[PDB]
Amino acid sequence: YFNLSGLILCPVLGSIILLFIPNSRIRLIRLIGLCASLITFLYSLVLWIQFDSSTAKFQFVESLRWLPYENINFYLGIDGISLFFVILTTFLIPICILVGWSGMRSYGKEYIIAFLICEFLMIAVFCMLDLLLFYVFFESVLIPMFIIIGVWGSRQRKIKAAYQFFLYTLLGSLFMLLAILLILFQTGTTDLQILLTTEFSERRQIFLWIAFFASFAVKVPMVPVHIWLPEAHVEAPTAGSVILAGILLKFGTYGFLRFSIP
């Protein structure tokens, strides 16, 4: 029985195993990282096979308590919208590992470890059905990508691009967090199945929609905040650009499809 727990724990085990391997054994690190990525991709492909396409209910649901009164909890589930995003975000990682195969002797273990942590944090984003924890994993991607941009940048400009990306992301993040807090206080929970069945007043819909738009429009650049994407794209390793263009630009669209529009 293939569930969402194993798909998320596979990159966790992959990153933990490489954490305690001597850096002199460069071959073993690359082999284990690539094997973990491929196993995760095959796990996602198997998850596709057993996906029912006739029910709107969330499938493969998993729960784990977060607050002591079960107000907010780790709710994991996939639907016909976020299944292909999970498959893509598990397929792109082995390609990113294979890109830096020749030069991996210089990057070390921190490269594959960073990419595996990225995969672990991005699989949970597309699977979360809790508004607050969707934000927690939504903006946890900054640290691995901050490290990727800065440590393994091309020129000295890597410091400026990382600052710009991080600052814009924070500006969106906290202004969305205020809206999430207001929803939690009024509704009482942050479960998507409950937030989709709560009649919001007309006045509060515009404010909350604008606050959600502030964070999402940055990650899907509309017009006035598209000045960080080119600099971050150019000042990034070859595999780093694949993550930014392949997945990180799909957070805004998925965020609009999953939360704002309903």
């Binding site: 710009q164 600052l167 814009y168 006035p224 000045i227």
Partner: peptide, 26 residues
């Protein structure tokens, strides 16, 4: 991009915090 969006952005003129944080010694 390089003009109004940048000057009114985060580093064209928002870098006044250097001219604001350093004044905290008062």
């Amino acid at each position: 991009d390089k003009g109004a969006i940048e000057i009114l952005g985060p580093y064209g003129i928002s870098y006044t915090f250097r001219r604001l944080a350093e004044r905290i010694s008062q």
